[PDB]
Design a protein around this ligand. Structure first.
Ligand code: HEM
Ligand code: NA
Length: 248
């Protein structure tokens, strides 16, 4: 369903240069997980029925950063400003999605296809559209399915983005990494979910919801058994998420 816009050769050149600069920066700063949260959590404000929100750079706005769900994303935005200034031609919308793609790549994940041309939109979406970590499978379908327009497969694969990073008690209130290797992108999120609650590792209620749902559980089993299958489905879902409301 996608018809990507034309961008100039100069725009394309800047995308390529920014991609490389983002690799070095994100690797050095150890901030891949925060950058993936910035890209992916921000994309998840899309509502398909109204064609509002989505990955259009509004998360830059202090007003959107101030939403309690976005606690800590101001750090991500601040970290990227100096680099972004080296690429004035790029939209913030494209820049943040590129950062998310690079975050997955530099931690060892799949190469998620990237298409430029997102425009920076003036008005943040209303607060309250983001997935709620305390809720379950019905809520996940409401947000990812009814609002975003993503599939059940996409939900489980994208939940695997928690294979990098950690929660912080001062941000969400939850605390700790999902895996023993929070800077490595692999299928351990699913392996850990299956094995039970190991000491020192985190499972949100929203992660646990995947285990008890008839459609989600087979996918969790698949990804725990087959990292290649996870990487394929993950790359597909991340691309879709990064493109919500964009190019159709
Ligand atoms: C499935 C629905 C989701 C829920 C309920 C959820 C919720 C959360 C929560 C509560 C945190 C902790 C924030 C903190 O305290 O620092 C978090 C972090 C994170 N999220 Fe999600 N999220 C979801 C989907 C996603 C998706 C789709 C992605 C990307 C594919 C993603 C990527 C991340 C990453 C990488 C972190 C770690 C950030 C860090 O290390 O600072 N999440 N998420
Ligand atoms: Na991991």
């Amino acid at each position: 369903g996608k018809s990507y816009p034309t961008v100039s050769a100069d725009y394309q050149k800047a995308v390529e240069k920014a991609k490389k600069k983002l690799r070095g920066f994100i690797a050095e700063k150890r901030c891949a997980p925060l950058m993936l949260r910035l890209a992916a959590h921000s994309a998840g404000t899309f509502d398909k029925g109204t064609k509002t929100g989505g990955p259009f750079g509004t998360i830059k706005h202090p007003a959107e950063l101030a939403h309690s769900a976005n606690n800590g994303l101001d750090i991500a935005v601040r970290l990227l400003e100096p680099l972004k200034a080296e690429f004035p031609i790029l939209s913030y919308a494209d820049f943040y999605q590129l950062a998310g793609v690079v975050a997955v790549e530099v931690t060892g994940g799949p190469e998620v296809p990237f298409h430029p041309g997102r425009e920076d939109k003036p008005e943040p979406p209303p607060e309250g559209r983001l997935p709620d970590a305390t809720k379950g499978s019905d809520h996940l379908r409401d947000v990812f399915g009814k609002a975003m327009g993503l599939t059940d497969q996409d939900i489980v694969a994208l939940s695997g983005g928690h294979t990098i990073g950690a929660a912080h008690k001062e941000r969400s209130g939850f605390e700790g990494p999902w895996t023993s290797n929070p800077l490595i992108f692999d299928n351990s999120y699913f392996t850990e979910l299956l094995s039970g609650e190991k000491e020192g590792l985190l499972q949100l209620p929203s992660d646990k919801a995947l285990l008890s749902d008839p459609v989600f559980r087979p996918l969790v089993d698949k990804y725990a058994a087959d990292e290649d299958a996870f990487f394929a489905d993950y790359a597909e879902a991340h691309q879709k998420l990064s493109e919500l409301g964009f190019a159709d």
